[model samples]
Target: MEHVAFGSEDIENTLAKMDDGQLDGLAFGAIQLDGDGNILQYNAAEGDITGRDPKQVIGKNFFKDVAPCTDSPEFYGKFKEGVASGNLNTMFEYTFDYQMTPTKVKVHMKKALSGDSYWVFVKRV
Candidate 1:
């Protein structure tokens, strides 16, 4: 988690205020999900990193369909817990290996302060 770079400030706060275009231009994957894990926003960098198009993922279940590798307790568990608790700001190291070759990454999860959505930041490590 500490290996990824997004500056020293609070990533969740910074990203939550960004518009779609601002998020799409990021160097790493930025995926916004609803309470149920449905894909609300899939940025361009995410598509490039995961080889998945935004058009194919929007409105889909992120943990189940788009990135099944995160369906486990390590990833999805934290997401569900965070949203349920309304205080999610957790980061951990993880490896994705579902449709593509295994890739190590830093995974950050945060529920929006507005209590309406969740955000997941994934950066290769």
Candidate 2:
């Protein structure tokens, strides 16, 4: 998706600089996923938000840990559509905690390129 021009060097630098609080003036989870949905990078803020450590998540499947709700056809279909069109600006403001004590999580997804593969950078709010 029509993402901001973040070159490989910029991406690498940003990744190296990503700590608990660096952007938006707030603590938020940030994850980078490859085209096959493998976790490439997960920040410390993300680990805190999900109660999962970056080491525990780095090699694990992102969809399984970050957003299990995306496993469905309906949601994944739209996500695929957005990626293909280079326009994934939709927000999912749903409960990730539980039905009764629901926690609101908003997801912002964008696409980036690394060599011949595309990556999805996900931030949570």
Candidate 3:
């Protein structure tokens, strides 16, 4: 599993026990952000895929700072709505194109079952 895998089961439990090494070992991007969009944890795979180091993005806003391409209603709006509703488990296919390669990916946005942390899992296609 990518840990960030689209079909991962019991992911909340998996996240509860995974460490940085395990997180980085994933094949997809795994970003743990707050309800306010501030990044909390970013894995190596995410940095490698986005060309951004985890250090550079920690404490940054995922939608506004790190990935402005997701600032639109189709993306950020869903996030905002999800947070407001307190139930944000969603998956979709998306194309990311800002300054890098126009990569297609599977996007999964989910809220931690026991915490305020939100996870954004991205698997490039």
Best by lDDT: 3
The positional error of residue 33 in candidate 2, measured at the CA in angstroms, is 0.5
lDDT tens readout by residue for model 2, 1-125 = 11223223345334444343442222455666665567766766556555666767766665565567566654556566765675544545444552223445666555544432233333444
lDDT per residue as tens, model 1, 15-101 = 766777788878788888889999888888778777888878899998878788888888898888887787788889998888787
Displacement of the residue 107 alpha carbon in candidate 1, Å: 0.7
Model 1 lDDT, residue 52, Cα = 84
> For candidate 2, what is the TM-score?
0.59
TM-score leader: 3
The superposed Cα distance between candidate 3 and the true structure at residue 51, in angstroms, equals 0.9
For each candidate, the alpha-carbon lDDT, in order, equals 0.79, 0.52, 0.82
Candidate 1 lDDT at 65 equals 80
For model 2, the stretches where C-alpha displacement exceeds 4 angstroms are 1-26, 64-66, 97-102, 113-125
lDDT of 3 by residue, 1-125 (tens): 44354548667777777776788888788898888999988989888877888878889988887789999888889899999999888888888887888888888898876577888888877
- What residue runs in model 3 are displaced by over 4 Å at the alpha carbon? 1-5
List of clashing residue pairs for candidate 1: none
